[PDB]
Design a protein around this ligand. Sequence first.
Ligand SMILES: Nc1ncnc2c1ncn2[C@@H]1O[C@H](COP(=O)(O)OP(=O)(O)O)[C@@H](O)[C@H]1O
Ligand SMILES: O=c1c(O)cccc2cc(O)c(O)c(O)c12
Ligand SMILES: [Mg+2]
Ligand SMILES: [Zn+2]
Length: 429
Amino acid sequence: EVLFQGPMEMILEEKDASDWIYRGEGGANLVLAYAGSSPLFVGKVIRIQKARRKNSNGVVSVLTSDEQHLWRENNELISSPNKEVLEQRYVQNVIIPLLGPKHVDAGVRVSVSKEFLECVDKKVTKQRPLWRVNAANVDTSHDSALILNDHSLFSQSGGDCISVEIKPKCGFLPTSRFIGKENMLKTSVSRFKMHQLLKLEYIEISEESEYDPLDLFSGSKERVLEAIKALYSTPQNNFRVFLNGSLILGGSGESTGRTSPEIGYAFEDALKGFIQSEDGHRTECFLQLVSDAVYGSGVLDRLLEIQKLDKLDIEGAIHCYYDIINQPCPICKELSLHALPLDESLKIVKEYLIAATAKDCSIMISFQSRNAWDSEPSGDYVSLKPTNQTFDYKVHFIDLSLKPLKRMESYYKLDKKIISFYNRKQKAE
Ligand SMILES: Nc1ncnc2c1ncn2[C@@H]1O[C@H](COP(=O)(O)OP(=O)(O)O)[C@@H](O)[C@H]1O
Ligand SMILES: O=c1c(O)cccc2cc(O)c(O)c(O)c12
Ligand SMILES: [Mg+2]
Ligand SMILES: [Zn+2]
């Protein structure tokens, strides 16, 4: 019998920085994969908050007063001390009751020192997209991070692990009575298709995408495989494929261009030893695999129901927003929405923000080939007949983030700019 220290929370220090390597980033977070030898972290990633270069006391504020009231239904949620606890609690107490816990497993919090976040910042700057380093770096005045399972790995070997990420976007067309007569194309063209035109105007993509979200969310196995083939053709930032955690198709921390014959030949070859098919045929087999696992899993049906919590479109919901923040409505100048009880205006706005989490999130699908000698069977698999192979798979949601109340104004101005530009571009017959 020996004396042990009393329980204490783990803090990561300069030593532990080198055990992580750049994986990717979006607008809010940097993500790193564990390249070390500890069993705690094998097959994990860490999610670190970026800084884009407070209440009535000078003390910084986690949620604004309006946000505390909007989300007051859960007392723990609005009591969150930092953004890491807020995100755990949002996923645990808001999202998982709506999606289920099978395809969601929130993270585990961990503390970090300032030198750790200075190491990670210097470490990754070389592998980040340049316009990302222009706009944001690691927030080194923070003291927490989130640990999560690495969903590009099937097993927390003797055979490659191949996985895909799909950012599916909004899969339905609005039916709101609050969409004005001039804007009726919003009822027949998807937001994603109209948005493409504006992205081209701003040099953010090089070609219009072939992908249509109404296909992927249709419930038709023919339409679904068609969407997967369009994603492969024009991935932009909606499709990525990893081999043992390393990217082999799509953009790194950013969107990318069309799959050229040269790209396709390289990808066709990277699939050797996962798909057992003669040369020039593995790609066709792999896209059927992804399609079958997306449709067979069923995960998109419940996701679409959360998106449809946006019931009035932003053209309706924006009026409830201006009641919430006790402001004269700039849009009007309507005694319908503005005559609602406070509690109903609040519910509409809150469900709008929840819908946005589901319109903005991603799905990661990892695969295990039973060809490998150390594979283990499960109840979730796809049988590839043209290849006489069986692949087990897992599906998980990522980026289930709480949206800030004040972005409501941004949502409205982008929408107005999308539909106006599309309207103009089509007038030119
Ligand atoms: N849990 C995870 N497992 C594996 N890869 C992940 C995981 N979470 C994020 N990533 C990768 O890192 C990227 C950025 O993460 P994300 O949380 O979307 O950042 P942001 O919140 O800034 O959009 C993702 O697009 C994905 O490729
Ligand atoms: O393209 C995006 C988009 O089209 C819509 C909505 C949210 C996004 C959020 C991100 O963090 C990001 O990097 C994006 O690239 C997008
Ligand atoms: Mg993201
Ligand atoms: Zn109004």
